[PDB]
Amino acid sequence: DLRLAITYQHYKEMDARGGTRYVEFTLNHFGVHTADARLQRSEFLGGHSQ
Amino acid sequence: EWLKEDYKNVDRTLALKASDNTPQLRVDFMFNTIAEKPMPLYSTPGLRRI
Amino acid sequence: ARVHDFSMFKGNHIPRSKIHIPHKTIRAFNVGEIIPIYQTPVYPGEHIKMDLTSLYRPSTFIVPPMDDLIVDTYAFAVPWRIVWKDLEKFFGENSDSWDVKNAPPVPDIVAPSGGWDYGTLADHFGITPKVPGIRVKSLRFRAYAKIINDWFRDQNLSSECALTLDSSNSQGSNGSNQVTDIQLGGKPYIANKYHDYFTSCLPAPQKGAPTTLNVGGMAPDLSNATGISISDLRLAITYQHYKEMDARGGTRYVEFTLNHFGVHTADARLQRSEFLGGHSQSLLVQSVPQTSSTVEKMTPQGNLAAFSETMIQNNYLVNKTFTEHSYIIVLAVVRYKHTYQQGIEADWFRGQDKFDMYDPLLANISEQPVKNREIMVQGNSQDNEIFGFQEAWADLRFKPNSVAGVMRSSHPQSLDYWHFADHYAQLPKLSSEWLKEDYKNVDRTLALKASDNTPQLRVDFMFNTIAEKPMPLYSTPGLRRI
Amino acid sequence: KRHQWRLTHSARSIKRANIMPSNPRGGRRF
Amino acid sequence: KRHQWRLTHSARSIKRANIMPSNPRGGRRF
Amino acid sequence: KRHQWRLTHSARSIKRANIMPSNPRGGRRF
């Protein structure tokens, strides 16, 4: 029961750092880049800052 | 008391005096430090040893 | 682009010369005593170069002993400033403006009634014993205690020697108290015995109170009572790691910095006395056969006695330059390695179940208690009580030195005059008194005992220093400037 | 190989050494 | 070295950059 | 290195020397 509790705390802390959007979940938990269009998100084209 | 610097000699040359409670100087300071510190790169909860 | 900003005159020109200073002193003392054998004042900018030759003559031995005596010699630099707070005020550094008005003189220590005794610290500093009514500057007695506190004290089992930094005078003492009387010039400080299995034990598994997880006692079947978070658990584990790190490495601030941050901090930055040099060597033992005939109720022809004569050379004992007013103190102590005849090794008690036996999985558990039965076994309830704490499974890394048979001290006809092994009248406790070296174990091997007031050691010390000092070659009256 | 001096008293030999400041178990002590 | 434009207003300079999607602390926000 | 003669009595050694007339502090005396 102690090992379960420690993993639950690791899980919720990982969710707090990285964000819980499904595109964010996949990168933090499995280390995977998932395409925005696969997930039905608007696509970022380009940008500049000055 | 005499050996201390005196802001009143500069003050008669200024259009707005400090005797009128206008500060003589307005300064912008930008610090850039490189610190090599005895800390982990990111501090992420959970311990290596028990 | 350039204007006139005041600068240094570069001052006067300071003379400089090299001086050979020979020195010879003859001493007698016992085993375990830390004895000042040298002292000198050092003015700023001197470079000191010191060689020492020593000749040790212990008391003659009944037989050649199956044990060794070891000499350690130590050199230190103590700034007057860390011993006395008014040093800067003394040379004229003023809290107020302009010159200092009333600067206190260097403090005095006054002799005890009837003077100091023989064998005291004042005796070996070169203060003449048994001369009442004399007073002397106290900064070197303070300097001695400072070196004990910085180096020789065991911070776990004892408090530090009393050290006064003020300008008030002090009252000398003949007492043997190892805390209060050291700066008062009394009996010398007794070195602690070398690190081994038993001398390395600690009072507790950590330095602090043992870390526990919280338990609430509230009752209204009990409602509420909450629990413990994973966050409170992480804090507790780090507190235990912290106190265990403090126990292993020592909590002096020079020690704290190395264990916690992995950093070497200089002794002079931290206001500690500076270690200059040191050497360690065992003593020679020459055995003498008996060439006289066997006489009834005497030793037989062919019996072996011994004497001990050893010449030790210390070159470069001190090599350095000094940037401030300071004292050089050189120390000597004789110690031996210890052997234990009254305990039983911890492995004879293992085997209640399989978790008593070593396993790689139990490699990283908490410090485990060393039982009293290991140091002295009495066959009573105290055997399973705790003497001290050691790292887990350390008895598998150590096998304490031992004695068996007629060699051991408790035998009615005992051969223990062949060795130095410990003998205990009662169960020893882990404490300051037990951790000190003991001259009585060596004393039963000697033809003339120190209990009979024969010193165990007679030593001749010859010092040769090359001093490059800020003095003229010869000091001849008359001045260059008016 | 066999004959030796009047200098043998024990099985264990001790080697001379320069002393250095060290940090043994429980803090510095000499 | 000394004289400079009518363009100095602060000690800190900011460099132009291409924007990329990133994952800072707490999720994506621009 | 260790063993030495029946000739060791003190830490200090004294070197043999030719005597010359000298002028130490306070005049000549031998």
Swiss-Prot record, chain A:
Coiled coil, from the record: none
Compartments reported by the entry: Virion; Host cytoplasm
Function, as annotated: Assembles to form an icosahedral capsid with a T=1 symmetry.
Family: Belongs to the microviridae F protein family.
UniProt name for this protein: Capsid protein VP1
Protein's organism: Spiroplasma virus 4
Full protein segment contained here: 303 to 352 of 553
From Swiss-Prot, chains D, E, F:
UniProt keyword DNA-binding present: yes
Principal location listed in the UniProt entry: virion
Alphabetically ordered keywords of this record: Capsid protein, DNA-binding, Host cytoplasm, Virion
The organism's place on the tree of life at top rank: Viruses
A single cellular component GO annotation: host cell cytoplasm
Subcellular location as annotated: Virion; Host cytoplasm
Transmembrane segments: none
GO molecular function: DNA binding
Keyword DNA-binding applies: yes
Function noted in UniProt: Mediates ssDNA packaging into virion, it locates to the internal surface of the capsid, thereby displacing the internal scaffolding protein during virion formation. Additionally, protein ORF8 plays a role in viral attachment to the host cell.
Homology family: Belongs to the microviridae J protein family.
Annotated protein name in UniProt: DNA binding protein ORF8
Residues of the full protein shown: 9 to 38 of 38
